[PDB]
Amino acid sequence: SKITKVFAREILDSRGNPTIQVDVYTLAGGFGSAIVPSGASTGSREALELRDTNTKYADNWYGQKGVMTAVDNVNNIIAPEIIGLCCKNQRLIDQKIIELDGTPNKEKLGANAILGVSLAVAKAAANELRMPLFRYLGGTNPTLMPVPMLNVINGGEHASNTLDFQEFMIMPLGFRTFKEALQAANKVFHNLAKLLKKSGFETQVGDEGGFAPNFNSHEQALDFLVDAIKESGFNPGFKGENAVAIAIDAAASEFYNGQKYVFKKLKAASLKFEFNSEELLNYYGQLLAKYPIISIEDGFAESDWQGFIAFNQKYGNNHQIVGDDLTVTNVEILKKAINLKAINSILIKLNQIGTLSETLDAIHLAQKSGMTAVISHRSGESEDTTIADLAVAVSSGQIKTGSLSRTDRIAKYNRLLVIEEYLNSYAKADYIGREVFYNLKKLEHHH
Amino acid sequence: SKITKVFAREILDSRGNPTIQVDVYTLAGGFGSAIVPSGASTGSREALELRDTNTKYADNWYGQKGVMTAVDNVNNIIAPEIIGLCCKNQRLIDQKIIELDGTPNKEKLGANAILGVSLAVAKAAANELRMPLFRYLGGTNPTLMPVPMLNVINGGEHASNTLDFQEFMIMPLGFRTFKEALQAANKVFHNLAKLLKKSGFETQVGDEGGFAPNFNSHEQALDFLVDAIKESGFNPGFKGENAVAIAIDAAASEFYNGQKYVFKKLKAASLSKNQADLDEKFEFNSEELLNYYGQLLAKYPIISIEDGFAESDWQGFIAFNQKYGNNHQIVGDDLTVTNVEILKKAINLKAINSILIKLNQIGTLSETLDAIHLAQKSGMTAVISHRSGESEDTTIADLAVAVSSGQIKTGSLSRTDRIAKYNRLLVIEEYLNSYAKADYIGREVFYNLKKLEHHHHHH
Amino acid sequence: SKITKVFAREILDSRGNPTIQVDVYTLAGGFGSAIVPSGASTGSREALELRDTNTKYADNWYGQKGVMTAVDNVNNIIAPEIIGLCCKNQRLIDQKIIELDGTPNKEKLGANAILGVSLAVAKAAANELRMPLFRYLGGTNPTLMPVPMLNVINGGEHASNTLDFQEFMIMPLGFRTFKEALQAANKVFHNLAKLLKKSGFETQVGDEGGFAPNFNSHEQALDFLVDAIKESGFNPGFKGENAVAIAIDAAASEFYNGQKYVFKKLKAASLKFEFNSEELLNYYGQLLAKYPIISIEDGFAESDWQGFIAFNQKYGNNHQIVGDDLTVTNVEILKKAINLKAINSILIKLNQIGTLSETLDAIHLAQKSGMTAVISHRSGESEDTTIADLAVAVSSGQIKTGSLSRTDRIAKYNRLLVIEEYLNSYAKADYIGREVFYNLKKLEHHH
Amino acid sequence: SKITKVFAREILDSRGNPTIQVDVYTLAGGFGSAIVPSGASTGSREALELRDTNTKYADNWYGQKGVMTAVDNVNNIIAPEIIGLCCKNQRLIDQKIIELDGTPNKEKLGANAILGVSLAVAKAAANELRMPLFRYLGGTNPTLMPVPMLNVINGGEHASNTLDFQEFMIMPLGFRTFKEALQAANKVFHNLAKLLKKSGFETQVGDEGGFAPNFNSHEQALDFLVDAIKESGFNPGFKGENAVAIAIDAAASEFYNGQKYVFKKLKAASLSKNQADLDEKFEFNSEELLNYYGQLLAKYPIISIEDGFAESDWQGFIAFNQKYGNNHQIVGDDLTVTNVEILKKAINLKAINSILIKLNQIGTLSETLDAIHLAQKSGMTAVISHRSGESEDTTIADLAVAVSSGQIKTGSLSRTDRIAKYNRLLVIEEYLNSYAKADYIGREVFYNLKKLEHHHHHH
Known part of the structure; x- marks a missing residue:
């Protein structure tokens, strides 16, 4: 069924540092929610999570570790691309979102923004299909x-x-x-x-x-x-x-x-x-x-x-x-x-x-x-x-x-x-x- | 709406000891699920959780800390009493389960079996009411x-x-x-x-x-x-x-x-060990x-x-x-x-x-x-x-x-x-x-x- | 569920004086209705009910005690602000309506207009939730x-x-x-x-x-x-x-x-x-x-x-x-x-x-x-x-x-x-x- | 649609004396509810309301004016006879309840029990038909x-x-x-x-x-x-x-x-009290x-x-x-x-x-x-x-x-x-x-x- 709503929020992980949670809803009543674990912020080899360094959010949390920018990327950029697609098309959604970011290490929108959506979409489909x-x-x-x-x-x-x-x-x-x-x-x-x-x-x-x-x-x-x-x-x-x-x-x-x-x-x-x-x-x-x-x-x-x-x-x-x-x-x-x-x-x-x-x-x-x-x-x-x-x-x-x-x-x-x-x-x-x-x-x- | 299913299982708590999770379903499609925290097993003053001491389950987990007896008490004793009742009647459900146990400190069925059902019922009613x-x-x-x-x-x-x-x-x-x-x-x-x-x-x-x-x-x-x-x-x-x-x-x-x-x-x-605290x-x-x-x-x-x-x-x-x-x-x-x-x-x-x-x-x-x-x-x-x-x-x-x-x-x-x-x-x-x-x-x-x-301020 | 209809009418209270009744309907089929009791028309300390004094309605009823103006305020002003909001959000609706009147003693739209809606909304939500x-x-x-x-x-x-x-x-x-x-x-x-x-x-x-x-x-x-x-x-x-x-x-x-x-x-x-x-x-x-x-x-x-x-x-x-x-x-x-x-x-x-x-x-x-x-x-x-x-x-x-x-x-x-x-x-x-x-x-x- | 539930209760009237309210539910979701006004208890000409005189209820309210007997008559006698009938059949329902009472002045079950059901049935049928x-x-x-x-x-x-x-x-x-x-x-x-x-x-x-x-x-x-x-x-x-x-x-x-x-x-x-009205x-x-x-x-x-x-x-x-x-x-x-x-x-x-x-x-x-x-x-x-x-x-x-x-x-x-x-x-x-x-x-x-x-005009 069609995705009707995608919404992200900033919560805390098990070490007391910010992370992102994503909820997905579908027309048929499916609901999926996922929380991204902590990952790398720099490195030339892995997908890169996006923190709030050098943003208006930097002082929200200790060490400038907020993820509001990633939350903004889900809520403002990724969500309107994804709403209206069938949630059971996992590979299409994932491919949609990779191209939307357009960089190989997902540095622009954030690996944490992208994974959050990717996983919540799959859980919503599984929930819908019971x-x-x-x-x-x-x-x-x-x-x-x-x-x-x-x-x-x-x-x-x-x-x-x-x-x-x-x-x-x-x-x-x-x-x-x-x-x-x-x-x-x-x-x-x-x-x-x-x-x-x-x-x-x-x-x-x-x-x-x-x-x-x-x-x-x-x-x-x-x-x-x-x-x-x-x-x-x-x-x-x-x-x-x-x-x-x-x-x-x-x-x-x-x-x-x-x-x-x-x-x-x-x-x-x-x-x-x-x-x-x-x-x-x-x-x-x-x-x-x-x-x-x-x-x-x-x-x-x-x-x-x-x-x-x-x-x-x-x-x-x-x-x-x-x-x-x-x-x-x-x-x-x-x-x-x-x-x-x-x-x-x-x-x-x-x-x-x-x-x-x-x-x-x-x-x-x-x-x-x-x-x-x-x-x-x-x-x-x-x-x-x-x-x-x-x-x-x-x-x-x-x-x-x-x-x-x-x-x-x-x-x-x-x-x-x-x-x-x-x-x-x-x-x-x-x-x-x-x-x-x-x-x-x-x-x-x-x- | 009416409760259709109550099911409990044994899982682990954040210290690595068994505890109990209860799921409740209602005819209208509500689902509620609760996990009971650790509590007291002995004591003359508080409600008593039931562990698997001196049961066929005692050897399941370290310290004889399993809670399968309480799980069985939910699945075999409390659930048939509760199914068919409207989930919105929190006080009725809690009263029925208190009477079903019959002891003031909830020792017979276990305070953990009772609380697990009490909370899952409420969450299912909230869930069904959106x-x-x-x-x-x-x-x-x-x-x-x-x-x-x-x-x-x-x-x-x-x-x-x-x-x-x-x-x-x-x-x-x-x-x-x-x-x-x-x-x-x-x-x-x-x-x-x-x-x-x-x-x-x-x-x-x-x-x-x-x-x-x-x-x-x-x-x-x-x-x-x-x-x-x-x-x-x-x-x-x-x-x-x-x-x-x-x-x-x-x-x-x-x-x-x-x-x-x-x-x-x-x-x-x-x-040192030989010393008393002569000065208090x-x-x-x-x-x-x-x-x-x-x-x-x-x-x-x-x-x-x-x-x-x-x-x-x-x-x-x-x-x-x-x-x-x-x-x-x-x-x-x-x-x-x-x-x-x-x-x-x-x-x-x-x-x-x-x-x-x-x-x-x-x-x-x-x-x-x-x-x-x-x-x-x-x-x-x-x-x-x-x-x-x-x-x-x-x-x-x-x-x-x-x-x-x-x-x-x-x-x-x-x-x-x-x-x-x-x-x-x-x-x-x-x-x-x-x-x-x-x-x-x-x-x-x-x-x-x-x-x-x-x-x-100087007090 | 969403409020679809808000409608007010003038009826009589238990002393034979006009008062206001408000009906609220919701998309899911909820219905709520409330009748405002009589209150103060002047005073500097309490919320003020609005009567038809010095209006085209003044001669409708004895003592100029009509409340058609309050009825008009519900039907013409309050209702379009409220329709399309979720009825279960009592605090939001109440706060919406307070700001819409904008005076501290509710003198502009009338305490009787405002309370009528406030109570009918709550009854509609309770009715909807059975x-x-x-x-x-x-x-x-x-x-x-x-x-x-x-x-x-x-x-x-x-x-x-x-x-x-x-x-x-x-x-x-x-x-x-x-x-x-x-x-x-x-x-x-x-x-x-x-x-x-x-x-x-x-x-x-x-x-x-x-x-x-x-x-x-x-x-x-x-x-x-x-x-x-x-x-x-x-x-x-x-x-x-x-x-x-x-x-x-x-x-x-x-x-x-x-x-x-x-x-x-x-x-x-x-x-x-x-x-x-x-x-x-x-x-x-x-x-x-x-x-x-x-x-x-x-x-x-x-x-x-x-x-x-x-x-x-x-x-x-x-x-x-x-x-x-x-x-x-x-x-x-x-x-x-x-x-x-x-x-x-x-x-x-x-x-x-x-x-x-x-x-x-x-x-x-x-x-x-x-x-x-x-x-x-x-x-x-x-x-x-x-x-x-x-x-x-x-x-x-x-x-x-x-x-x-x-x-x-x-x-x-x-x-x-x-x-x-x-x-x-x-x-x-x-x-x-x-x-x-x-x-x-x-x-x-x-x- | 079919009547599924008929329930009566005792409440108070505008003079502070007991009277009866009847609720009727239909399978289609109609709800009707009526409150019976005060009437005559004795008399050889009109339908007779039933009060609680010479019953275990007599002491409930001043003047022995309770109406619990009529409430019981709705809940225990009239309701099982009426549930399952289509609510739109007003004349059928009223005929059935008249025959169920069997006395011309409605004395056995009470005119108040009978009217309460009669009206709640009609209101439920109107309510279900919008x-x-x-x-x-x-x-x-x-x-x-x-x-x-x-x-x-x-x-x-x-x-x-x-x-x-x-x-x-x-x-x-x-x-x-x-x-x-x-x-x-x-x-x-x-x-x-x-x-x-x-x-x-x-x-x-x-x-x-x-x-x-x-x-x-x-x-x-x-x-x-x-x-x-x-x-x-x-x-x-x-x-x-x-x-x-x-x-x-x-x-x-x-x-x-x-x-x-x-x-x-x-x-x-x-x-004065000693005087007759000699002049008429x-x-x-x-x-x-x-x-x-x-x-x-x-x-x-x-x-x-x-x-x-x-x-x-x-x-x-x-x-x-x-x-x-x-x-x-x-x-x-x-x-x-x-x-x-x-x-x-x-x-x-x-x-x-x-x-x-x-x-x-x-x-x-x-x-x-x-x-x-x-x-x-x-x-x-x-x-x-x-x-x-x-x-x-x-x-x-x-x-x-x-x-x-x-x-x-x-x-x-x-x-x-x-x-x-x-x-x-x-x-x-x-x-x-x-x-x-x-x-x-x-x-x-x-x-x-x-x-x-x-x-x-001068007549």
Whole structure:
């Protein structure tokens, strides 16, 4: 049915910074509403969100982070182009809006203005057809509940501990249903908190609702994590029942100087810290041998493609190698990562590319080529749960959407529970654990 | 129109523990859906949520915290009783479900099963009437956007720091609109986070999205707060433009031992383990604690103090309200637990001039509205409050506007479990701006204060 | 839904004088109709109704009391401003209409033109939503049936008896339901009439359907009233079951010469009559000691604020002190009465302020400050029963709407019976008698 | 469309006594609601309302006047019989309810229960057809706005004055429109009230909103009336512009003793208690009373006299109609009590040329329409009448227009129980002005008068 009304407003995201919400109405009574997550404002590689810097709105909010200009672009520019088009024509609307902005990185109107409309339009159509969004996006056959990557331990520049790696995650593999996998994650998370309190660590949380306790090294954190998995009644590893694996996001661009990798906080604490690409690759195989790490993200720097290609060739048959800063959901960079065998997996961030149709094009390219497409959250989030319906719609098999606290993450797990409930009555719900890694030629026993 | 379907499910709250969501459908096409916040499981005074302890469900989630029994109670017991009733009859529905449970503290079916149905019914009726929830709850005339009590600094039992008081809050008073007041709180919050980092304090957050840095005393925390307000461009105080006040939740039941109040984290930091407090430096009887509050009130722009004395120390409250109740808000939380009979006692004894309102502590929407109305009729403010375990549900935003509470307490400025409520207030403000008027009146919401003074004035 | 039609006509009120009726229709089929009661045509303090004086309509009706000009203002000026607005936006419509008139006392278009539209709009919205008006006005929670103040005995300038006080009322307190309270009032009223006939007094009625028999003094009237309450089977007093209290409207502005109060008819009959403020205050305490008078209205003159303040301070803890001529439902005067502790209660007359939203603002201000808001009728009335729904919507706890004869009063009691019936099935109906006086610090036993 | 719900309740009438209101709903969304006026409880001739005497309800209201039994009879007996019938079948419904009661005077269920349903059914059918009630009752052609008989001066049993006749009325004849005639009555009424005050008379009102001042005789009252008409700017008379006539309800059954008519209030004012009326100064046989009427008719512009003779004095009526029936209206009220069989007798004996019509004296709408039609076919006028106990119900306004009665009797110009009917006539006049034509024909409504004369003419 025809779109009758498009309206945007400025609200706050989960970090206390402005973001944009878009409502869409249709003649037949459909209503769709979406909230854009936080993204990049500068960069030459990703779609660019538009903030209120150097406008009459700049002083509204701290750091000039308002998005009223994007709101004005939706309400004044995008809306009259879109009103009167059939809402079920997602690809036409997305293409309409891309051309209206006319720049490749969506810098003129704002990636946040464009994505907000793109997603609200799709939700309005799904609402009108009285279909869950994952059915509208995916057709009749989606059944695959994704394995979650749950943040638990955090490092990097902004964390006061001595972990130079960015984040550590658990992945609940050996379970028959999504509900049981989430229950296991709930047990590991709360037992993890209990152990951290028992050893005198802090249990406050960061932007993803995980912990950043004062660990002295990667090895200590990995040791602590293995123990918490065992305390909860599960088995650290890949195969078998109750298996729970670990995944790491190294964010290696952050500790690369163009020639060497430096564990800067570890080095400062001691007052091996330096690695060339081959030595860093060696450290990983040490960790991969000792601990049950199924997946490493941004193991090397965005400018160290040779490190990536050698990483993928040495461990990519048996471990997931994820690009994030390497690829920024850029289809052209993805084609090069495919052609050069640099990774076997990619993070998908809707607001890094700017529309739903482009995101689906990028997901399909990654999967056609034998990689997994891990649907990812952002730092600044909301109760919008699009990415839960997206992960089921495209059979991603994997989602990355935070630890087990804060509604900005929890809502996505709740949405997966509601989707699982819907598939249990009116279809079939599938949770296949370790089998989601179709990109790994062989998956071996960790022991 | 008639209720056709009531369905409940188990989901997770913002602390990662199970809670309950209820959906209600009406024959006219209305849909309403509510998520119950975390509450008390034991206690002799408030409505009791039901967890899965000693059931076939106990092993589902950590700590035996599932709520499948309450889900079954909605789906198997409450729903057949409620289907077929007109959804607009809120008081009838709530009365029927209260009688169906039959216990005064809602223990049999669970206060969480009962509140979930109570709220989803109301939202479905509003949805079918194409009215915002606050217009359904409140009639034609509500226009009052509430002043937020924004958590920023946390202390008390579980914080590693040396603050014995449980939380410190800012209240943006001297602003023309709710949007501008929220912009001011945004500026104080991020400037506070920058100042904290600048001094080497931690900037992770707790349950309500505020900070628990390693402060050494109440005074150190309060000094830091005052400077953050100034650094943001505002004036710490009560009256005038750009005024930003402070509120405190002492939660004094937690450091009362039966006879004296003991600043036990502060004392464990000075005294070694073999030492007694021979000088009574960290101990206070009621009057001595009242003297300490008076000192803080004179030096710092503290407009409101919650649970200044213990739940069993009614005398301490009565003396507190006697000495500073004309010029300062005195809130009962643990003292009153949203209990109508205890509020009548507090009104009769003149113990407080304000009360926190927690939907799930009383257990239905109609009883909550009875309790709010009794508080306001008696000249008290009713502060609509969040819980520690929360969701994207924003009922309390609409409730605060519907009853013209004038004040809401729903957390710091991070985490969607708090942010969604401020966002709902922004949407309500936008609705009132085009179809009515939105009023933000700042310090004028303290109608319970006989004489609000200038803070900078020498008292 | 959108207002499609607004139409006004001139009809007659209950005194045989013109008044205005307004109909409102909406696109969805809602219909609302309201009749304005009679109000002031001159005065510098209240909203001013517009009569046909010095127009081509002046000779239509006796005393030039037509309201065709107001009817023309609704049909020609107000209606085209309002048509096409959503009827559920009461505050917007009221604010629209205030600005359209543009004068503070609504003198240009007429308070009667403005109130007629304001009320008909609200009834149309309530009708459209298939909600009783008190639910539309008040939300989900209203349950409080008000205690009625029933006129029974009348004095003042226009009454040929020797009562200088304006009116005497009964208030049925000690009863469990509104129905029973009204039944008690019906018994006192008819027994009162029987006793008056037995003693040779006249039983014809005035504008409020009460009596004005040839009593010689206030004391004789109060004696007669106490006896009738006893004859009917009830107890004169405040507390206990079957308690029925008395309330007085002195209308003291009428017998004040700027320096003294003169009981003029009592003085003329004798051919104590003169009182300064302190002596008048003394007379009241005499009556308050002898008879069960719970409430005195306009005990002192509108220009004698010092008399009011001393009245409230000497008996206001235990008796209701009502302003009427003192405050004329004027929010700014009300603020001064609150600030100066002159009264603990105020009459609310919708057509003295001019719109429903302003009336609700005034009610809310009075209640927030610890006063009771007594919803009042006017002398010239109709079968419109708005004030019954208003008293329940705002939990006034008290209504003042006439004696127990004439449909211009009876309709309001019937509407309370229909509201009580609605609350009995679909909610709860509450009648709390003596507890409505939350403004009285202590309520003592009259004996 | 089909009736889906019939519900009755007890409310109060304009004298503060219980009466009954009935609501009727139809499947198509029609709603109709009627309020029954006060009637007779005992009597051998008219339909009988049922009060709560000797029931569990007797103590509810003063005088045992409740009507809950009739309410129960609607809700428990009549409603199940009527639900499912098409609402447009007025005659069917009325026939079914008459048979359901089974007694000729409607004593078993109550004439008030029966009439309430009868009228609410008709109003619901009109409401569902989006027709004003008078178009539903009357067809396409009604246009005749009735001349009002406006009570102004009251006497008889309960008035303290010395008038033995029960009421005096004005009728505004010489005017072009109903609005103008009502404006004239408004002017006479308020000028009459001013003149009364000017002479020290009382100005409170009785049941019908007219005056009962302390007049000494019929002549004094009639003189006052004539001067008020002149003071208002009109001409007391029958013909020509601005004519205002007078009508009288003698209610002569009240001062007939069986043999003679006795002006008993007039006599109690002249004669002391020990005195007989040796001269027969205040007594009248039939012929002597007819001579007295003739005297008043010659001096005063009296166009109509109601109940000039007693209910049992059929001969007095027959002689009255013989002597002055060509030139004056002769109304039966107590004589006929809206009884079809008694009207046939009055027609056959030529006792009257006009009859009052009281819905609740016969008990259904179809029987009322039968009675009106029989009266008009026989050359009589049918004057649609109010009762002493009334409400804002305005059925009789629509009824008077629907049947082209030409005359209505519904009280003075104060009290909503009377004013609402004039207001309904103003709304009907407005409807006819835009969608048809409104006719006010003044003196021409007396089609029952063989020769209406000029009053000022010497007869």
